C-alpha cells in the first residue's frame, strides 16, 4: 500500500525525524523511504515480518538515480504486529542512524550526497499517526 | 516554502493536528488542504500584516486552479515568535478549524470533498509536528 509522502522536509544533518505508526495485526512488511525523491533514497528502511521469503528481518538499502544499492540486513527486529512503533532517524555525511523501539539503534552508510533529506514516503502495513521534525 | 504532504487519507470526523513555529518577523502564513495543489478545500491564511490585511485570517478555496471567494474571520489568536497548533476536521458541509486559546470557526466545504489527501505549508510558519487522530 502507498502511504504518506512528504516533501520539502529540509531535514538537516543532526536533526531528528520521528515517525510513529500502527503496525497492522496481519502486517507482512512496511517501508520508510528517505532521500531527495522517489529515485534517490539515502535510506530504504524495510522491516519484513513475512515478505520476500524473510521473517522478522530489517532490510535496508539505498537508491541512487533509480539504481538500488547493495542491500544490508540488521540483526534485531523490535517490531510486533498489532502494536504502535516509533522510528527516529538522523544523519550526517557518513551515516544514517536509525533508533528503534526496545533500545535498539544501528547505522547505515550514507551513500548519496544530499545536503538535506527533503523526501519521505511510507508504504505498507504501518499507519502513520505522527511525524515530528 | 514549507512542508508538502500527500496521501494524507484524512476522512470525515478525523482530526489533523499541525504544530509549528510562527516566525519572529511573521507577516503571513498559509496552510493549504485539499485533494491536490489545484483543488483546495481550505486555504488558511493568517495575515499579521500582508496583502491589505492586518491581524486577520483569510480563508478561501481553489477549484480546478481557480480561487474562490475569500472569507475573513473575526478572531486572530496568533502572535509572531511563538508556537501554535491548529486542528482541523471536516465533514460533508464544513471544515472546522480549531485555533489557539479556544477559538474555532467553520468554513464551508465548497468542493464537497469526502477525503483530504494534500496539505502544504507556506510563509512564516515552520511545521514541527503533524498528527492524525
Ligand atoms: C520496489 C521496491 C521495494 O522492494 C524491494 C526492496 O525492498 C529491495 C531493497 O534491497 O529488496 C527487494 O527485494 C530483493 C530481496 O531483498 C533480495 N534478498 C536477498 C536475501 O538478498 C533478493 O535476493 C535474491 C535472492 C537470494 O532480491 C530481491 C528483489 O530485488 C524488494 O523487492
Ligand atoms: C497565490 C497565492 C497566495 O496568496 C494569495 C492568496 O492568499 C489569495 C487568497 O484569496 O489572496 C491573495 O491576495 C489578495 C488579497 O486577499 C486582497 N486583499 C483584500 C484586502 O481584498 C487583494 O486586494 C487588493 C489589495 C487591497 O488582492 C490580493 C490578490 O488577489 C494572495 O495573493
Swiss-Prot record, chain A:
InterPro entries: ConA-like_dom_sf (IPR013320), Galectin-like (IPR044156), Galectin_CRD (IPR001079). GO terms for biological process: apoptotic process; cell-cell adhesion; myoblast differentiation; negative regulation of T-helper 17 cell lineage commitment; plasma cell differentiation; positive regulation of apoptotic process; positive regulation of canonical NF-kappaB signal transduction; positive regulation of inflammatory response. GO terms for cellular component: collagen-containing extracellular matrix; cytoplasm; cytosol; endoplasmic reticulum lumen; extracellular exosome; extracellular region; extracellular space; galectin complex. The modification Phosphoserine is found at residue 29. Coiled coil: none annotated. It comes from the Eukaryota. A beta-D-galactoside binds at residues 44-48, 52, 61, 68-71. Keywords: Acetylation, Apoptosis, Cytoplasm, Extracellular matrix, Lectin, Phosphoprotein, Secreted. The modification N6-succinyllysine is found at residue 107. Expressed in placenta, maternal decidua and fetal membranes. Within placenta, expressed in trophoblasts, stromal cells, villous endothelium, syncytiotrophoblast apical membrane and villous stroma. Within fetal membranes, expressed in amnion, chorioamniotic mesenchyma and chorion (at protein level). Expressed in cardiac, smooth, and skeletal muscle, neurons, thymus, kidney and hematopoietic cells. Lectin that binds beta-galactoside and a wide array of complex carbohydrates. Plays a role in regulating apoptosis, cell proliferation and cell differentiation. Inhibits CD45 protein phosphatase activity and therefore the dephosphorylation of Lyn kinase. Strong inducer of T-cell apoptosis. Plays a negative role in Th17 cell differentiation via activation of the receptor CD69. This is Galectin-1. It comes from Homo sapiens.
UniProtKB/Swiss-Prot annotation, chain B:
A beta-D-galactoside binds at residues 43-47, 51, 60, 67-70. The modification N6-acetyllysine is found at residues 11, 27, 106, 126. GO terms for cellular component: collagen-containing extracellular matrix; cytoplasm; cytosol; endoplasmic reticulum lumen; extracellular exosome; extracellular region; extracellular space; galectin complex. Lectin that binds beta-galactoside and a wide array of complex carbohydrates. Plays a role in regulating apoptosis, cell proliferation and cell differentiation. Inhibits CD45 protein phosphatase activity and therefore the dephosphorylation of Lyn kinase. Strong inducer of T-cell apoptosis. Plays a negative role in Th17 cell differentiation via activation of the receptor CD69. It comes from Homo sapiens (Human). One of its GO terms (molecular function) is receptor ligand activity. One of its GO terms (biological process) is plasma cell differentiation. Transmembrane segments: none annotated. Keywords: Acetylation, Apoptosis, Cytoplasm, Extracellular matrix, Lectin, Phosphoprotein, Secreted. The gene is LGALS1. Coiled coil: none annotated. Residues 2-133 form the Galectin domain. Its main location: secreted. It is found in: Secreted, Extracellular space, Extracellular matrix; Cytoplasm; Secreted. The modification N6-succinyllysine is found at residue 106. This is Galectin-1. The modification Phosphoserine is found at residue 28. PANTHER family: GALECTIN (PTHR11346), GALECTIN-1 (PTHR11346:SF97). PROSITE patterns: GALECTIN. It comes from the Eukaryota. Expressed in placenta, maternal decidua and fetal membranes. Within placenta, expressed in trophoblasts, stromal cells, villous endothelium, syncytiotrophoblast apical membrane and villous stroma. Within fetal membranes, expressed in amnion, chorioamniotic mesenchyma and chorion (at protein level). Expressed in cardiac, smooth, and skeletal muscle, neurons, thymus, kidney and hematopoietic cells. Homodimer. Binds LGALS3BP. Interacts with CD2, CD3, CD4, CD6, CD7, CD43, ALCAM and CD45. Interacts with laminin (via poly-N-acetyllactosamine). Interacts with SUSD2. Interacts with cargo receptor TMED10; the interaction mediates the translocation from the cytoplasm into the ERGIC (endoplasmic reticulum-Golgi intermediate compartment) and thereby secretion. Interacts with CD69.
Amino acid at each position: 500500500a502507498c502511504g504518506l509522502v512528504a516533501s520539502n522536509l529540509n531535514l538537516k544533518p543532526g536533526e531528528c525525524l520521528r515517525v510513529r505508526g500502527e503496525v497492522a495485526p496481519d502486517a507482512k512488511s512496511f517501508v520508510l523511504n528517505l532521500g531527495k525523491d522517489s529515485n534517490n533514497l539515502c535510506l530504504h528502511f524495510n522491516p519484513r515480518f513475512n515478505a520476500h521469503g524473510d521473517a522478522n528481518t530489517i532490510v535496508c538499502n539505498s537508491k541512487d538515480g533509480g539504481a538500488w544499492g547493495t542491500e544490508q540486513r540488521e540483526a534485531v527486529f523490535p517490531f510486533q504486529p498489532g502494536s504502535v512503533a516509533e522510528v527516529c532517524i538522523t544523519f550526517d555525511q557518513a551515516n544514517l542512524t536509525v533508533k528503534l523501539p526496545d533500545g535498539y539503534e544501528f547505522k547505515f552508510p550514507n551513500r548519496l550526497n544530499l545536503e538535506a533529506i527533503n523526501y519521505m514516503a511510507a508504504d505498507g502495513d504501518f499507519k502513520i499517526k505522527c511525524v515530528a521534525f
